Amino acid sequence: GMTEYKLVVVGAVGVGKSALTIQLIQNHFVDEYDPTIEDSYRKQVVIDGETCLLDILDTAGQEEYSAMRDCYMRTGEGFLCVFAINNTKSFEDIHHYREQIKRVKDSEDVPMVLVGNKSDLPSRTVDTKQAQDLARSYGIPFIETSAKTRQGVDDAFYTLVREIRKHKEK
């Protein structure tokens, strides 16, 4: 029937993957979501005038040597690669997540969006220009979000769905 999209949210612990996912699904901010809970959520949404169903996997935790994890990446069609703008390491680890995805899916072009989360925080350590430069280099959209205020949350997920559309159209 209507088009389904398998989305996977990856990124360092603490960056806001669960908060972003819950804002999208449940439209509220949860500020203490169990950091170890990994789960999938479905929601029917309208993007660009068309209804579609998002199946979203909020990852956690053991990253390497995990059959379950590798399976999510094989199956996933698009990936939100999240870092927190006050957490430089989480930004400088993005490449690790990207490498793992390209490895498991064995493809040079996989739909991804770079998400700089925690935009509401006054102290950043990652400049917008830096994130922009990395995303441009990767050939992927970059979007700043705040799960706390909800700014950019729909935009992050809709943009990824749009990247999946193109991939299919090419």
Ligand X SMILES: Nc1nc2c(ncn2[C@@H]2O[C@H](COP(=O)(O)OP(=O)(O)O)[C@@H](O)[C@H]2O)c(=O)[nH]1
Q: Of 71, 127, 136, 168, which one interacts with ligand 2XR (CB under 6 A)?
A: 71
Torsion, CA 100, CA 63, CA 17, CA 71, rounded to 10: 70
Letters for 111-150 (x = contact with ligand X by CB under 6 A, - = none) are ------xx-xx------------------------xxx--
- Least gap, CB of 24 to Mg ion (angstroms): 13
Q: Which is nearer to its own copies, 33 or 41 (CB)?
A: 41
What angle do the packed helices 67-75 and 94-105 form, to 10 degrees? 80
Phi, psi of 17 (to 5 degrees): -60, -50
What angle do the packed helices 17-26 and 153-169 form, to 10 degrees? 90
Pairing relation of β-strands 39-47 and 50-58? antiparallel
Q: Of its own copies, ligand X, ligand 2XR, none, which one does residue 8 interact with (CB within 5 to 8 Å by kind)?
A: ligand 2XR
- Least gap, CB of 123 to ligand X (angstroms): 9
Q: Of Mg ion, its own copies, ligand 2XR, none, which one does residue 1 interact with (CB within 5 to 8 Å by kind)?
A: its own copies
Three-class DSSP category at 81: strand
- Least gap, CB of 44 to its own copies (angstroms): 11
Q: Which is nearer to ligand 2XR, 59 or 87 (CB)?
A: 59
41 counts as binding ligand X under rule CB under 6 A: no
- Which residues in the 106-165 window bind its own copies by CB under 8 A? 106
Cis peptide before 61 (omega within 30 of 0): yes
72 counts as binding ligand 2XR under rule CB under 6 A: yes
Q: Which is nearer to its own copies, 7 or 94 (CB)?
A: 7
The secondary structure of 5-61 as a DSSP string is EEEEEEE-TTSSHHHHHHHHHHSS--S---TT--EEEEEEEEETTEEEEEEEEE--S
Query: What residue ranges bind its own copies (CB under 8 A)?
Result: 1, 3, 6, 40, 42, 55, 67-68, 71-72, 74-75, 106, 167-168, 170
